[PDB]
C-alpha cells in the first residue's frame, strides 16, 4: 500500500491489506530470545593443565616470557586472544613455527544471530573431554579475579594452589563430564556484544570492553606436579546461555557474495 | 426401487439396475472444508463443472484373462484425454490452478445380457502408479490402444516395475525386487468397490472423498485416486451373442477447491 | 530407605539442547539491575519486521537500488526468486535471521521507494508469480499473476506484500537442494509507463528496494548457522 | 591363434525383460535352433538369463539330455523385469574364469539378445562387463531382436560387424559359430 | 520461561538457580515510535 | 445368509445368523493401530562416521565422486537407497565388486501390516551399537534440512561441524545406548505408505514422496579427525512408532505360492 | 537430600516392547492437522471384516473362483482346510493380518458369489466339517456336518459363517507344526443339484469365493512377520 | 492410549512428549456406506 519509508517506521502489513486474503495462523515461538540462546554450543578447545600454571601476562607480551598459553578459556562470545578479551578475531592461515600461536576463540553460533547490542544471561558450562578416559577437573575464577599461580608442598609433592579455593573446582569422574551453571558475575550491568567506548586500562583501545565475560575456566588433572604426563591432553568447553535477555537491535554479519 | 437418476448440473445419467451409491469412508463425501494450506480464496464449485464426464474405455473380450486390469487415473484422465474423456470446463480450470482438492464420484457402465457371464471389479484404488510404464514415462493414448488391458503379471503383484530414479554410474545398480505401489490382486476389494456382475447390475456407483498426504495437492501431478476395472471372472458366451461389450465410465468431481491461479500450464 | 530406581538407556548422556536446568555452582548472586535499558528484544521477530536493504548485481560491489533505464524493453526491470537463500536476501534481516532457521511461514513484505526527483511521474507494475515452469518475462505474462500498479506521486513508497501461497504449512527457508525453476516463484518489477521527466532532470532514477517481514511471518526449527561470515 | 583350441564353448545370454514379453516365442526358437544344430561333443553350451537377477539356467554342460532338459525349461520362462545385461555377463564371466583354470586353451563365445535397450546407468556396466569378458578371452556376439540401436550394441559386441538382427541371426550364426569348429582341434 | 520443560518442580531455590537483580529503590511493541 | 456381494458392503455376520449359536466374547485389542506399531524394530545398520563426512550427492551420481556412503540412515519405513528415499527396494543377489554397493533399507515388520495408505506417528529411535565397548554419538537433522559437512580446527585438531548444532546430538556413554523420541517434523500432514503422485523435484518420478521421513540420523565417534581409527564400526538403529494413526485402508504384500 | 534407591537386575536393559515412554529430544512441535483425512483405521479388525478374494489352484497363476463342471461326481467341488496358514488364505486380509499374529478367536465368514448367467438355476451344499480322522468327500458324509443349502436366484451371494468350534479359547493361527489331518476341519462346496442352463448359455459357470471375518473375530499376540514378501 | 502402562505420572508436558496438532480455526464404524 501507499506508504513513506523515509518516515523510518513501516507498519508490517499482510496479504489482506492490498489484496483479498487472510491472516496465516502463528506457527511457533522459536524466535524467542530466551528460547533461542538456551541451547549448548562449543566455545573453545583448551589444553589441560598438568602443573602450577603461569597465567598469560598482559599485552604487549615480549619474547622469553615462560608462560602457559592455551590453557585458560575466557568464557565470552566476543573474540578473545591468548585467554584475554580482544576486538578482532584472528585465525592463522599458514601457521609457520615462528612465535607462539595464540589460541583465539569466538562463538560462531552467537554472532550469526546476535542482532542486538547488549546481552545478559546466566551461563551453563559443560566441559566435555576430548580424550579417552580422562579424569580432569574444571577450575574457575570470576570476572575480575586472577589465577593463583604457585604450589604448596604437601608430603613432598608439589600440589598447586589451583586445587583449592573459594570458587568452584568441580572434579570429574573418570570418563565423565562437568556441568554447572554460572551466574552473571560481571560488574557491568550487561555484556556488550558491540562496544564503542574506550577501556581506560593498560593502554586504551577503542571497542574493547574490560569486563564483558562470565569468568575464565581452566582444566587441570588432579595429581601433583611430580606425576606429570608427557602428551598433551585437550578438553572441550560447551556453553549455554540460561535466561537470556537482549536489548537494542543491531546488525548481523556481512555474508559475502563470492 | 432400482431406478436412480443422478442429476448433476446440466448432465443427468440414468440406471435401471442400480445397486446403490457406495459412499466411501464417510456418510456424505460431498461435505469438504477449504484447504488449510492456502492464504487466498479458493475457486469453489460452479455450475459448469458440477456435471458428469462420460468417456469410453476399452472393450472386454474373451481374450482377457483373470485379473487383467485397466487403470483410469483421476484427475489424470482429464488432462491426457484418456478414452475420449475431454474434461470440458473442468480441465480448462485445472490447467490454470496450481493446487486442486476434490473428491470424486464415478460410475462404470457395462451392459451384459442375461446370457453372458463375467464380473468386473470396479474400485477406486488410492495412490497408485498403474498408468505409468515400468520405465517412468506415463502411457500415451497409443500404448493404451496397443495392449487394451494390462495383464496382472508378477511385476505388478510384487511392485517390481514401479518407476525409479537412475542411480548413475557410481552406484552398482541393485537388483530391485519390491516396491510399495504393488497390486495384491486378491485384496482389491478392501478399496471402495462394487462388482459389476453380468447378472445383478450394469452400473456400479462409487463416491469417494478427497484423500491425500497434504490438505490440497498439486493439480498436474496428483494421482490420489485411480479407477481400476479388474476382471475377476472372464467373459464367456455362446456363438451368436453380442461379442465385445463396451465399457464406459462417468466421473464427476464433488466439491472441488482450486487454489493458486496462474496462466495455462506450459511444460 | 533407598528408593529403588531404574536408570534409563540415556543415562549420563550429555544432550546439548535438553529442555531442563542443571546444578548451580556459585549462586546467591544479585546482579545489577537493567531497568534503565530501553528497547528489549523480547522476540527476534521484532527485527524481521524492520525493513532492511536488498542487494542487486549492477548492470563485491553490489547496489541496493535498481537503476531505471530510458530504453523500452518488455522484460522485468529486476526479477528475483522468492527464496530466502537467494543472494538478494543474504544481508536483509529477514533472510539472515531465517537462514539460521529451518522453516518459515508467512508473508515477505517488499517495500519500494522511488528515490528519483520530485518532478518525475511514472508507474510500475509489481508482479509476484507463483512457481510456473517458465519465469514470466512479458508484461502480459505478468499482468495475469498477482500484481499491483504503483503510481509515483507525493507519497514515495509501496509495500507489496508477497502472499504465502504454498501447499505445505511451513516452507523450507533454504532451497540449497537439487534445483529447478525455484519455488516459491518470482517477484518482478515491470515499468508500465516510462518515467516522464521534465527538462534538466537526471536521467535514470533509482528505485531503492527493501525487504521486511509481514505481520504473520513466523519461523521454526533452529539449525546450526553457517560460520562463513568470519573467514 | 594358429594353435587349435582344446575346448570350445557357447553362452546364450538371453533377455527376459518386460520388453521381450511379446517376443519370447521368437527368442526361444532362435536358441533351440542353434542347440539342435550343433550336436558336437566338443561344444559345451550354457543358458544364462537376465531380467533383474542374472541367473545361470544351465551350467556349462554338453550332455544332450541335460541340454534338452535345459531347453524344456527355457520354453516355460516368463519374461518381465528390468534389463540388467551386465548381470547376464557376470554369470558368463564366472564361467570363463573358472574354465581358464583347467590348462585347456578353450574358446568362449557369447551370444546376447535384447529388445529394450539399456538406460545410461545400466549401459555403463554392461559395456564394462563386456570389456571384462573380452579380457577373459571371449568373442561377444550381440543378436538383436526387434528395433534396436546398433550403437548401443556396438560397444557391447566386438564391433558393428558382430551385431546381427534376429531374422538374419541364424543365417549369420550358421557358419560364424561353425568357422571356429573347423579351426578347433 | 525459556527452553525449560520442568513445569513441575524446582529443587534449588530461585536465588541459587537463577540470578535475580537487586532493587534500586504476545504483543510485540515496536522499537521505533513516530511522534 | 442371502446377501449381495456386488453391493460392495457385506455385513459381518455371526454363527447365530444362519444357525443356532452364540456370540463369542471379545478376546483382546491387540489389533489396535496405536498398540500394534508402538513397539521397536530394526531399521538399518549404518556405519559410524570417523571424520567430517560428505553427504551423498543426489541422483544420478557419476563415478569419481568422493563421497561417504552408508553412514546416514533416512528414518523411513518406505524403501530407501544411498540414504535417500526411493521407490523400489533392491537387494544385491551376487554383489560383485564393480561399483559402490548402495545401502538400501526397508521396514520389513511394517509393510507386512501396512494395510493402509497414510500413516502418522512420532518416532522413538534407539541406536544400539554392534561393537564391543563403542562410545559413539547420534546426530540428527530434520526432514528438510541438510548435513553440515566441514571441519573447524580447534587446537590443531580438525573437529568437524557435526559435533555442534541446534538439532539433538545425543552422546552415548561407553557400552551404552542412545534413545530419544522424535516428533512428526515433516511438512506433509501424513506419511504416504503408498504414494501415487509425482514429486516435482530433480527430474520428476512418479510414486516417490519427497518429504515422507522423520529425518536422518548418523553415528559419529566423538574424537577429532587426527584420532581416526582403521577398522569399520557399525551401529544398529531401532525404531518405534509412538502414537500411531493410520488412514485409508489398502493392500498387504503379495505372498507367493512357490 | 539423596533419595536412596536400589536399581534392579534389569538396569540399563533395552527391551524393545517396554510399555512406556522415553525422553523427548526436539519437542514443542505443532504438527499440521489431519482433520481433513477421512477413513481412519482405529483398529485393524476393520479390515479383516472387509471380504477379500481367495486363491484356488486351477484344474503362480491361481484363480479366485471355482469352475463348475457339468460332470457328476460325489466329491466336493472345492475343499480346503480351515487353517489360516493354508495357501487359499495367504492373500486374504483375514489370513494375512492373522498370520502376523499368534492366536485368533471367532468366526471366519466365507462369502460366495455365483458369477454365472442370470438364467442359471442350481443349488449348492456348503459343509463345514469339524476335524475328523478322514476328510468327508461323499455328499452323505457332508450332509451330516454343519451344512447349508444355497439356492441360486435373484440375490447372488451367500455368507456361510464358519462356527468357532474348538476346545481352546484361542486357536493357533499358524499350523506349521508336525502335521495331521488338520484342525480346524474342512470347508467343502458340494453341488447338490446340477446347474440347469437354457440353450445358448455358457457351460461351466464360476463361483467367486470371498473370505471375511465375523463380527466376533478377535486376534491376540503379535509376532514377528515373515519378511519373505520382499525376495 | 496405546502401548503405554504409565497410567500414573507423566514427567514431561504433553507438548514436549507428544506432538499436538495446531488449530485450523468399541464402536467400529464401517469404511463404506451403501446409500
Ligand atoms: Mg527390455
From Swiss-Prot, chain D:
Q: Which residues are glycosylated?
A: 131, 149
Highest taxon in the source lineage: Eukaryota
Q: Where in the cell is it found?
A: Cell membrane; Cell projection, Lamellipodium membrane; Cell projection, Filopodium membrane
**Per UniProt, where does a divalent metal cation bind?**
17, 19, 83
How is expression of this protein distributed across tissues? Detected in umbilical vein endothelial cells (at protein level). Highly expressed in tumor endothelial cells.
UniProt's post-translational modification comment states: Glycosylated. Glycosylation is essential for Seneca Valley virus (SVV) attachment and entry. Phosphorylated upon PLAU binding.
Q: What does this protein do?
A: Plays a role in cell attachment and migration. Interacts with extracellular matrix proteins and with the actin cytoskeleton and thereby plays an important role in normal extracellular matrix (ECM) homeostasis. Mediates adhesion of cells to type 1 collagen and gelatin, reorganization of the actin cytoskeleton and promotes cell spreading. Plays a role in the angiogenic response of cultured umbilical vein endothelial cells. May also act as a receptor for PLAU. Upon ligand binding, stimulates the phosphorylation of EGFR and ERK1/2. (Microbial infection) Acts as a receptor for protective antigen (PA) of B.anthracis.
Describe the disease involvement stated in the record for this chain.
Hemangioma, capillary infantile: A condition characterized by dull red, firm, dome-shaped hemangiomas, sharply demarcated from surrounding skin, usually presenting at birth or occurring within the first two or three months of life. They result from highly proliferative, localized growth of capillary endothelium and generally undergo regression and involution without scarring. GAPO syndrome: An autosomal recessive disease characterized by growth retardation, alopecia, failure of tooth eruption, and progressive optic atrophy in some patients.
Q: Where is this region: Interaction with PA?
A: 119-125
Domain VWFA: start-end pairs: 9-180
Assembly notes? Interacts with gelatin and type 1 collagen. Interacts with the actin cytoskeleton. (Microbial infection) Interacts (via VWFA domain) with the protective antigen (PA) of B.anthracis. Binding does not occur in the presence of calcium.
| Disulphide-bonded residues | 4-185
**Name used for this protein in its record:** Anthrax toxin receptor 1
Induction remark: Up-regulated in cultured angiogenic umbilical vein endothelial cells.
Q: Which residues lie on this side of the membrane: Extracellular?
A: 3-185
Q: Which family does it belong to?
A: Belongs to the ATR family.
